[PDB]
Symmetry: D2
Subunit: 235 residues, 4 copies
Amino acid sequence: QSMSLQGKVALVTGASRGIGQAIALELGRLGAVVIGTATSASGAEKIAETLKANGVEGAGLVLDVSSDESVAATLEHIQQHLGQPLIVVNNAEWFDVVNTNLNSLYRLSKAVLRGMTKARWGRIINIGSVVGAMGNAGQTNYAAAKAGLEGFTRALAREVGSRAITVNAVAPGFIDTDMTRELPEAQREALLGQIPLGRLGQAEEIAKVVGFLASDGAAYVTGATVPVNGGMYMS
Amino acid sequence: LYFQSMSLQGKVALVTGASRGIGQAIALELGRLGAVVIGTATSASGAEKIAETLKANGVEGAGLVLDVSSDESVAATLEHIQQHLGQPLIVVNNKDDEWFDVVNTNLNSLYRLSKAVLRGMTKARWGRIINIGSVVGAMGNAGQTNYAAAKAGLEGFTRALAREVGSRAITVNAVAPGFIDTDMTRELPEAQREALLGQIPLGRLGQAEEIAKVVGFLASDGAAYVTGATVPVNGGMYMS
Amino acid sequence: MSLQGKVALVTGASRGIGQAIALELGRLGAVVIGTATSASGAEKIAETLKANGVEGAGLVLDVSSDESVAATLEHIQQHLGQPLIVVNNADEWFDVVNTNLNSLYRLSKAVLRGMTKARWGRIINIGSVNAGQTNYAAAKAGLEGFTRALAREVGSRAITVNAVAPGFIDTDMTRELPEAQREALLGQIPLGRLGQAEEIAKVVGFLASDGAAYVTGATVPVNGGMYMS
Amino acid sequence: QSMSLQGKVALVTGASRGIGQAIALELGRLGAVVIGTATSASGAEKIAETLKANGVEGAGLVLDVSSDESVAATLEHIQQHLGQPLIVVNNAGDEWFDVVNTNLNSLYRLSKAVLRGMTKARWGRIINIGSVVGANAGQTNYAAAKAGLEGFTRALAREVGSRAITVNAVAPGFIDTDMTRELPEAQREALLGQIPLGRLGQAEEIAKVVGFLASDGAAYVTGATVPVNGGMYMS
Ligand SMILES: c1ccc(-n2nnc(-c3ccccc3OCc3ccco3)n2)cc1
Ligand SMILES: c1ccc(-n2nnc(-c3ccccc3OCc3ccco3)n2)cc1
């Protein structure tokens, strides 16, 4: 009725598995034409099979977000064949890590903005990292990137707002993915002891939110980091 | 028999302060997602108006009189609601020195009501509590103080209540409106508007519906791993 | 001796953190009025002041009760003078937090008449130290917000309002918790130790100082790196 | 009583003017041996004159924080002559991304460098100074760097804490500096109408806080960003 993204071309990066794939399908299912990407050809192929499998119009694709060449090429390629994407979704020593992420977020976001600017409409949606038990160190990085995301996101939202382009972030919590499904029994129950709802979040649950923010309904929402974590907040 | 799947069909929502603007927009948006909807006001004139508006938009439900500050109103209102319609599981709560009294009163009320409706959500092992912030309400620096002060209370309160309740699959979330198209704003000087819109990255006021849509979202089953959160709806203008 | 000729009021100063604040203020030349909820307490405070050469007075005060507050201040004023450094350090989560802030309000309101005349003041609010996680965060949220609001409402009159947020502090309650739950918890504090009460005091003392006069509405976290929300 | 910084060697970057200089003197005044730096020889010479002038033992110095060579050289130079600095103070503050990215890398570079020394001594202070507010785009950057500082500062505090080294940030507000002191009379009163205390902050007022954090008293304070702004808070 009104959660229709019909006739809108979405771009989901890192969409071969878990959260990213869940975002891809959810966007399609809301009528989006959907371009999922991965770092490899094998990956990009897989994505397409999965789209066709669920009736979603679109295309798998190979993209290295760290490399300008890839980005410039990928977009150019996308534009000609499918159209210009207006819903763009970024999915993916603490210093190096965080520094690299935000530069990428930047690189890509910058690239896609020319297109959103012409159309005077856009959605950028940035996905946080999942919580993962690498100990004391795990707590440091999680918080560090989550801090970067929040800040970054809000800044970029301020810089584009005049052109009716929202920018928002989603901060997953302890999510049921391939990564989590094989962590030690201890670090699981310890961590569930910290989540008020007492379960992991399913990828779909992230997707749904992503889908929301994409919608026209959530058009006065910009610069915001929606926490999806069943109540476990870390700061 | 009716027997639905993807939206709020067969769920009884309660929206407080639903006669005007933001609250009414929430009421309709819930109805439109199939909710059976109980809007309330502080007066009979108000409660009657709400019902007219529901019928007008085909929404099943009832206008109702409720004083959130007074325990017995609350106890009575819920009791009434339960028997006739059912138990609500989606419940939606809608110059400086003032700031303490204002904020104190709100949270006590938020508490009172929330407590009341929880007995029901607990039996059903499912719920949604959704708390609406105040709108940016004056200019001045005093406006800045109160706005921030309630927005701070809401954020904190919301998150706390989410923590004491989460076991029972009941989300608690808040929505923080920005500068929203209202009576207050509709009659301001031609300067203080554009100055203020120079403050909002998106360059416009938020329509009530825009708040509603988010409310509606959080209500949905999709947004079931979202709890204790305060979603800012403000077109980019952030204040503390 | 940098708060010389300034009359400080420290609530809940018989033990641990509050007492540490009391002494630290005295030591910076403050005339110091410590309070407790009982006569036995108030007596003790005075002994301790004398013991450390600090001019001032122990006193009985129920912060929840307007009568006490109005009376206590009146009493203080006549005998010692008007306090301009005032330091608040005296299911369940809502009641708890609600009560605290109302008290913070009550008292703060009371002492402001005095600071306003003098066009100078310090209000310093001290934070508390599964369910434990909920309340800790809940009051800490209230304190931060409350503090900042009140700072906005008084600023014109050169009165700072600030908060201090203790972490895991070495006090009576903590010093005897199980050997396991200590090391587990120290594994969460980056600095690897508990905070001594004095460490809070030193900050309190700082904020009191004229140096920290452009610092208002702020909540200084004293927690050795362990941050929680 | 007695609580100063005697026998401790402090390093203040960008200490020729305003806030940085105020920090330099305040540290000296608390007995610190003090090494102020600037980007030029003219600057570095001036700093020394000012130290002598106020009886403070130490040295002016030339340092480009963006360039590894400078940093490695400067520290080496400092160490053999004066000693190893254990109080280190970083003073500094479309294009919001580049700006903030550059700052934090620098904060990183230097902080890393000086940590070898603090680690040997099992004691340290790192103190990071935020940028001053200037009165739209100003709002974006101010918030953006203030966000980076807060986050960065915390993270680094988490990574060094075991070694009894605090890391803290100070967030100046609208401060009376040469930069601010020549803005229009209108935009002054308008802005003071936004600061609860109704005045600008003097550099010294920052310094005093810096001095505090340096002290042994503020040793259980780490990862924190102390706001010095007379009540005007922005995000
Ligand atoms: C002024 C400024 C902030 C606040 N609060 N910020 N957070 C809270 C709060 C957080 C969790 C649970 C309850 C809370 O409010 C208790 C309260 C205190 C005064 C009135 O209501 N209160 C209250 C008054
Ligand atoms: C570690 C911890 C926090 C952060 N940041 N927190 N916020 C930001 C940030 C916010 C808005 C714009 C840019 C930001 O950082 C860019 C960056 C981070 C690292 C390298 O370059 N970064 C960076 C590294």
